[PDB]
Every structure is written in C-alpha cells, then in structure tokens.
Amino acid sequence: YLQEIYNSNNQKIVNLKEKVAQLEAQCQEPCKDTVQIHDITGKDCQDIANKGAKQSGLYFIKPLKANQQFLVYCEIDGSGNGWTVFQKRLDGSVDFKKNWIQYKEGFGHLSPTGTTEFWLGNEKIHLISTQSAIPYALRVELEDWNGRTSTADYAMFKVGPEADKYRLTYAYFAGGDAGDAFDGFDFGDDPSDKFFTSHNGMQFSTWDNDNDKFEGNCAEQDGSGWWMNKCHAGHLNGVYYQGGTYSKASTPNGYDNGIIWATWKTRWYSMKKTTMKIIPFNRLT
C-alpha cells in the first residue's frame, strides 16, 4: 500500500542480483567447436595408427626432415592402416587454379569428417614421401557421377624437392581398376601421344611456373597445378564439372581441362570425387 509495494519489488531485487550472478557463471565458456585435432602424432598417418589412433580425422605429423609439424587428415581404416591424404575433391567448392606458392604451401580446408576439398602442399608431400628409405605407395581413389568407384596404385611414389620442381616419380603401376593414366594415353592423333601425356618423371607446373614439355603452358591453358607434360592424361587438380560429361565448348581454351583419368573414362568426362593418399608400401600385401 503506502510503504508497501515499495519493499516488494525492492525485495525481489537482491534476489534478482543473485540470479544474475548465476547467469554470469553460465556464460564464460566459448562456443563449442565441433572440429577437434587428436593428440597422437607421428612421422605420418600410418605411424599414428600403429600408435593406436582408432579413428579417421585430423592429427599433426612431423616427418623426419621437417623442422616444424603440420596438420594432416588421416584415414584410419579399421584394419590398422593409416593413410595420409594429400588431395581431395568432392564438390567444386575450392578453386584449384592457384599459383606456385599456393601449390607449395597448400590451400583448401582440413575437416574431421573428410568433407573438405584441399591440396596438402607440395613441400609437405615432399617431406613425408622422402623422409626415410621406407618406400611409400600412392593410391588414387576416383568416383564417377553414378557412384561407381575405382583405384590405381603406384609403388615407390616420391615427390622431389623444390630445387627439382617437385618432380613426381614412381617405380611402377601396382594395379587397380582405374587404369594406369600416369602412363600416358594414346589419344590417337599422333604416334607420340602416349609419351607426351605420361606423368612419371614430370616436374610440377602452375600458370606462373611452367616446367612442362609443351612450347606453351599446360597449367595456364588448363587452369590447375599439375605434373604436366604436353599436357596430361591423368588430371585431378582440374576444373570441377558438375554432371561428369562436359564438352570442348564449355572449356575456356578448347582443351580438356576437367578431372580426368583417361584410362577409366574419356577426357570429356570429369570425376565426381578424387582422393590422393599415401601409405608405406609394406602395408599392401
């Protein structure tokens, strides 16, 4: 009434100040980030599995020659095999027309769930692949626009230092249904076609760093960074074409520039998904 209603609300308050204090304590922690990095490290993703990692995802590895560690995406099969993934395409969300520097350091994003496209860099691929005498094997996994998949393994896969332009080299094709595109393809226009499209032994090129065997510039004309040779038969850093089928008309300079593997599909067909991952070779049989 008089002095009444005054000390009602005027009493709620002290108690209100205290609810507030509970609210404040409920509001100190940051949003919870669904992406986490595991704490097992090693020379590479196989080494991480041998150490008990039991799950695909993000880990840090530190190759023998590296003088700083780095985040990789490991594929842990429940079989005890740890694959280090260095390349991944699955939607055309990342632009792969990048320059030398970007190909050397890496671009794209690493995701726990592997739903992220990326190019680990060239330098990294180099440090892992040559850190010891234990030969590595490269496995390419491809997927068409009809859910079919195929693979191609290469044995003794190595990427050279920057002084040699991150030259690719392998001892031999180890089989797979995808077919040996790194061996070059007979497009049938000239007797030298197969040799001019092979990859084994090629230096890496980008538009700004031509090391191809073409008078012109394969990476500039196809829009990617790849181990080019006048120019290619296997091209996974190609332009992402929705649908698979594409035509010369859709291309920017008139040459096939999609994500091809000419020994599995035609060069006028671009893959749906692409993975390039490595594992110490003894892991295969």
């Binding site: 393809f185 497009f187 226009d189 000239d190 001019f196 038969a233 040459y255 096939d256 000419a262």
Partner: peptide, 4 residues
C-alpha cells in the same frame, strides 16, 4: 589431354 594432348597437344597436337
């Protein structure tokens, strides 16, 4: 591809 190739370069004819």
């Amino acid at each position: 591809g190739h370069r004819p």
